[PDB]
Structures are given as structure tokens and as C-alpha cells.
């Protein structure tokens, strides 16, 4: 028994998108979730769901909804899925095995690319252990080798943990920036805060 539409507009159409390093997380509750506006429009190239189907989204109710957003390379969109492996999955953003939700990703080369630039977006390349599901790491400490302590980036394993994609138009489709939004759902019984536009 709610009437206010969910704030999907400020999540998908937002001009700014967070880095895969320190990705953003927006909570959605107490609203009507009409998903037709998402997949009906042209710019959203890819849209996949796990545990549910795109057509059934408008007919379901959800107890809690989270909208994670970030930017990754085109070839790395594959890594955004349950049980996957790779830099983004291992060190930046990992989904749970029982993930229930959908992943929306589309090309944003026109927005997020500059000729010899686009240092806005960074990703973690070194970490001692893989992240837990939905884990977040904002630290940037140097990755000391162990045979000698480190205070700054040095030789052998003493690397600076983060790196930047440096998107440019000259890159191919695979390396071009892709704007990604991940929706997570919970399907328990009442109370339920999010429901579709049903009667």
C-alpha cells in the first residue's frame, strides 16, 4: 500500500558514477518499483537477472533493495556475476553465490572517456586476500614485499595497490568504459517495503 515511485532515476541517469574501487551503494525502500522504464529504453544494452526474470520483476515484492554502481572495462563485465574470478571479482566487487538480483551494464564511452585521460576511475590490483561478498575496501596502503618493510612504492612486490583504466576513445569496445548498476533483492515475507505497480 504505497504510492511513491522508487528513485531509480537518480541511480541510472546520474552523471557521476563511483569507481569500482570504493563503489557506491544506495538503499531503496518504501517505494513502488516499476522496472519497465529501465529495459524499455535504448541505452541499457545488457540486462541479466539471477533468481528472477526481467519480466517478473514488476510482479514481485522485495523486503530490501540495494543499488550498487561503478564503472568497469567492457571485457570485465563478465566478471560481474556469481562465482566468477578475476581482479574485479577478487579484489574490488564480489557477488555472493546465492546472489538474488540483476546486473545492468551499458557502454558509456561517450561520457567516461577522454583523449589521453579519464583517470576518474580506478581499480584495485593487489590484495592479500579475496574480498567477501559485497565487501568494500577504501584503503590504499602499500603492498610490502615482506623481506623488508615499506613506506612507499618500491621494487619487487612493493607496489601501489590501485591503478586507473585511463579510458580514451582510441580504445576498442572491449576496453571502453561500461556503466554498471547492480540491483540486489530480498524475497522474505512481510514486512515488504518494495513492490511492483500491481493492483
Amino acid at each position: 500500500n504505497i504510492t511513491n515511485l522508487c528513485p531509480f532515476d537518480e541511480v541510472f541517469n546520474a552523471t557521476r558514477f563511483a569507481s569500482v574501487y570504493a563503489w557506491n551503494r544506495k538503499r531503496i525502500s518504501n517505494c513502488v518499483a516499476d522496472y519497465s522504464v529501465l529495459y524499455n529504453l535504448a541505452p541499457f544494452f545488457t540486462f541479466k537477472c539471477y533468481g528472477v526474470s526481467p519480466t517478473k520483476l514488476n510482479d514481485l515484492c522485495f523486503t530490501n533493495v540495494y543499488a550498487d554502481s561503478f564503472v568497469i572495462r567492457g571485457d570485465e563485465v563478465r566478471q560481474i556475476a556469481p562465482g566468477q574470478t578475476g581482479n574485479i571479482a577478487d579484489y574490488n566487487y564480489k557477488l555472493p553465490d546465492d546472489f538474488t538480483g540483476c546486473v545492468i551494464a551499458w557502454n558509456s564511452n561517450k561520457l567516461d572517456s577522454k583523449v589521453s585521460g579519464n583517470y576518474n576511475y580506478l581499480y584495485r590490483l593487489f590484495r592479500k586476500s579475496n574480498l567477501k561478498p559485497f565487501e568494500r575496501d577504501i584503503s590504499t596502503e602499500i603492498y610490502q614485499a615482506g623481506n623488508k618493510p615499506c613506506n612507499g612504492v618500491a621494487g619487487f612486490n612493493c607496489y601501489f595497490p590501485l591503478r586507473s583504466y585511463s579510458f580514451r576513445p582510441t580504445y576498442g569496445v572491449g576496453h571502453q568504459p561500461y556503466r554498471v548498476v547492480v540491483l540486489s533483492f530480498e524475497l522474505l515475507h512481510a514486512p515488504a517495503t518494495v513492490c511492483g505497480p500491481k493492483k
Partner: antibody
Amino acid sequence: QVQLVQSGAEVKKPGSSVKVSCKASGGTFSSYAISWVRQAPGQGLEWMGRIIPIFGTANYAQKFQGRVTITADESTSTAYMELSSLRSEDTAVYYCASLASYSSGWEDVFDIWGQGTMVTVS
Amino acid sequence: DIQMTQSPSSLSASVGDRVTITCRASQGISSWLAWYQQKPGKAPKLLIYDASNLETGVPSRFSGSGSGTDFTFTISSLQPEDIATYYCQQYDNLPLTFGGGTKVEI
């Protein structure tokens, strides 16, 4: 908090070079990117180049390409920029500023600006 | 390189008078514009970092909006502390270009 402190002013005859610096203070040097902006007397601001010391990448405008060099020194956290073959129209106030781009999802907009150095040819 | 035309070059207005400054890009930019405030003999201050996003600590008195080529920055009211020169900066592409600037006079 972040603060940028620039060196003193400089006065030179034409054909010389300048070696101004801006020392980063507060936080850690692993989180700053520096850009240099020119402002001729009474005219608008002009962007020269960008330096990201951690990634070891620098960029310059087309006019200053091959004439301005920007460097940095981690040991002293001093961002260095040099201008070669000085000529009278190079006179301007030069500002050291920190980019927001080199961070999570921000852009090139300059957040913190240095006190600026007066450079004149005479 | 991408060039921006900023008009009017100078605008004079009284206390409490609304101010409107127009910045026009020669090529379409996807809202990647920022506005700065420069007091005489002082470094520019970043007022608006995105097409409409105000920086922390900047009074809501200031505002801005626009997309594509045409952008506008406005002051809801002229306080004495608002008399300054404002520049529009485009950062869609690497060769950052500042606008011609708009000198504000009481």
C-alpha cells in the same frame, strides 16, 4: 585536510627558465594530483598541464607541448614545473592546484589552489 | 581545441539582484562543466564542480544548470561578498578550456 604551498615569486630576463614548486601538506602524497594554471595580467585562466606522480604520467597543452615540463619528487613531495625559452608574453601568475579526478569517481575540477607565484619578464 | 564563449563579459547589478551568466561550448559536452569564483588578487574558488552540483561549504545562494553546449550559472541574490569574477571551465576532454570570465560589479 589538504593544503598547497607555493614557492616565492620570480623575475627574469627573456630566454631563461623557471623552476617553481608547490609543496603538498597534510594527508599523504599518494593521494594528490597536481595541475598548473596560467593567468596573464588581467586575462582569463589557462590550463597548462597535468601530473599524476604515482602513475608517472604527465600531460601538457598543445601550446606548451615541448616547452613545459612537469615533475614531482616523493621524497620532498614537491611538484615541479619548468618553462623554457621565456618570452615577454610568458608573464603571468602561475597557480598550483590539486585535481579531484585522481580519486573515486571525481573529475578534473580543481579543489585546492596554491597561493600562486608572480612570474614576470623584465 | 574545444573553445568556450562566456557572456556577458561584465554585468553590473545591485544588492539582492539576481545574476545570470551564460557559458556556451563550441562542442557538446555531457554536463562536464564547472564554475569558479575569483576575488581580486586571490586564487579562484571552486563554487560548482558539476553542471548543477554545489561544493561542500558553498552557499546555496549560487546555482547552475545546463547540458550540451549551453550552460547557465545564477546567483539568487547579490550580497556584497558575491562581487567577483566567475569563470566556466570545461573538462569533458583533456585540453581544459576556461571561459572568458564575467566581471561582476555592484
